[PDB]
Design an enzyme around this catalytic site. Sequence first.
Site, short mmCIF file in Angstrom:
data_model
loop_
_atom_site.label_atom_id
_atom_site.label_comp_id
_atom_site.label_asym_id
_atom_site.label_seq_id
_atom_site.Cartn_x
_atom_site.Cartn_y
_atom_site.Cartn_z
N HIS A 61 35.20 -18.70 -29.04
CA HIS A 61 35.39 -17.20 -28.84
C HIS A 61 36.50 -16.67 -29.72
O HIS A 61 36.35 -15.56 -30.24
CB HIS A 61 35.73 -16.87 -27.35
N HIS A 91 46.37 -15.62 -29.08
CA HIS A 91 45.11 -15.59 -29.84
C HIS A 91 44.92 -14.14 -30.35
O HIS A 91 45.72 -13.27 -30.04
CB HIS A 91 43.89 -15.93 -28.98
N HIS A 93 41.88 -11.03 -31.57
CA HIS A 93 40.54 -10.45 -31.65
C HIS A 93 40.42 -9.69 -32.95
O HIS A 93 41.37 -9.05 -33.33
CB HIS A 93 40.24 -9.47 -30.43
N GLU A 103 40.91 -4.52 -29.49
CA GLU A 103 40.29 -4.24 -28.14
C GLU A 103 40.87 -2.95 -27.57
O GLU A 103 40.12 -1.99 -27.27
CB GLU A 103 40.68 -5.44 -27.23
N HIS A 116 47.20 -11.18 -28.85
CA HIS A 116 47.54 -11.24 -27.48
C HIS A 116 48.40 -12.45 -27.24
O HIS A 116 47.95 -13.58 -27.45
CB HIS A 116 46.25 -11.37 -26.67
N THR A 195 40.39 -9.61 -20.95
CA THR A 195 39.36 -8.90 -21.68
C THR A 195 38.18 -9.83 -21.93
O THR A 195 37.26 -9.42 -22.57
CB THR A 195 39.90 -8.34 -23.01
N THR A 196 38.28 -11.09 -21.52
CA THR A 196 37.16 -12.03 -21.65
C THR A 196 36.81 -12.52 -20.27
O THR A 196 37.63 -12.57 -19.38
CB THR A 196 37.56 -13.27 -22.44
N1 LIG Z 1 42.03 -11.55 -24.12
S1 LIG Z 1 43.16 -11.75 -22.97
O1 LIG Z 1 42.91 -10.88 -21.84
O2 LIG Z 1 44.52 -11.64 -23.59
C1 LIG Z 1 43.09 -13.44 -22.36
C2 LIG Z 1 42.28 -14.32 -22.97
C3 LIG Z 1 42.24 -15.68 -22.58
C4 LIG Z 1 41.31 -16.67 -23.35
O3 LIG Z 1 41.74 -17.85 -23.65
C5 LIG Z 1 39.90 -16.20 -23.70
S2 LIG Z 1 38.53 -17.44 -23.51
C6 LIG Z 1 38.78 -17.85 -21.79
N2 LIG Z 1 39.73 -17.24 -21.04
C7 LIG Z 1 39.66 -17.82 -19.85
C8 LIG Z 1 40.45 -17.58 -18.74
C9 LIG Z 1 40.07 -18.31 -17.64
BR1 LIG Z 1 41.17 -17.84 -16.15
C10 LIG Z 1 39.03 -19.28 -17.57
C11 LIG Z 1 38.28 -19.51 -18.74
C12 LIG Z 1 38.64 -18.75 -19.87
N3 LIG Z 1 38.10 -18.77 -21.09
C13 LIG Z 1 43.12 -16.08 -21.56
C14 LIG Z 1 43.94 -15.20 -20.95
C15 LIG Z 1 43.97 -13.85 -21.36
CL1 LIG Z 1 45.03 -12.84 -20.59
ZN LIG Z 2 42.74 -11.48 -25.91
#
Ligand SMILES: NS(=O)(=O)c1cc(C(=O)CSc2nc3cc(Br)ccc3[nH]2)ccc1Cl
Ligand SMILES: [Zn+2]
Length: 257
Positions: A61, A91, A93, A103, A116, A195-196
């Site tokens: 992703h 990471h 986007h 986003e 982020h 957001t995911t």
């Molecule tokens: N895009 S974002 O909102 O900053 C954000 C993205 C992610 C990622 O690593 C995106 S892919 C992803 N995020 C997850 C979170 C959980 Br619970 C369980 C499985 C996941 N897979 C993890 C935390 C946050 Cl806060």
């Molecule tokens: Zn993010």
Amino acid sequence: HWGYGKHNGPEHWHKDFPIAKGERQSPVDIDTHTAKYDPSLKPLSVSYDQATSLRILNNGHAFNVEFDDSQDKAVLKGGPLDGTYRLIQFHFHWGSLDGQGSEHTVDKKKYAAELHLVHWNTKYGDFGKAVQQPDGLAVLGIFLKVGSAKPGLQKVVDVLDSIKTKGKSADFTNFDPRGLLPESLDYWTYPGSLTTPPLLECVTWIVLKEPISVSSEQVLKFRKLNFNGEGEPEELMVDNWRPAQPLKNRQIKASFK
Ligand SMILES: NS(=O)(=O)c1cc(C(=O)CSc2nc3cc(Br)ccc3[nH]2)ccc1Cl
Ligand SMILES: [Zn+2]
């Protein structure tokens, strides 16, 4: 099997993750004129001098730069936050074109990408427990525009060719995330979500007003990553952003002006 395509992208996510249509989903459009200045908000405190990066991972992703969060090293506090939040990963986007990729949007403006920096509230002991709480995470969101290069990004850009495909990782030590921050820490903030998927409604969003500059060549390198795994047909990792979601019953607060 969620992703960012026609058949499994953002408009599908609600079938597996019905909170997609919840009351505090992210991202949102930041309408800068109707953001309220909050003179009770504190300066953001970003203490990254002791940050310990470990690894970089292509998770299919985006890519995550991961930190050792087993001690009190790289912490975010202050700003709108009530306690201490520890950095676990960052990471980005980004888009297929420089005109999209962020986003959050600012008066409907899309940036080329958005970083982020994900932190979890130390009162919940770890990231997995913190995501089950309404104040579990604080994400520092920074916009990227294309212009000059960001020298402090280049170490990340250079490693990407080692993690082209889903499931690849590479040692990634001694990366200093201070080199990704703009000069000013003026921000907007509002209560939201991942957001995911799983789209959990656990995040205090802190979005910096000042973007960082990255070069066209730096963002081109992000676009050479792959959503697919090695030995699968190539699907370039681009457009891995969720569009703005309804603000519903929320107020965005500004730390400035
Ligand atoms: N895009 S974002 O909102 O900053 C954000 C993205 C992610 C990622 O690593 C995106 S892919 C992803 N995020 C997850 C979170 C959980 Br619970 C369980 C499985 C996941 N897979 C993890 C935390 C946050 Cl806060
Ligand atoms: Zn993010």
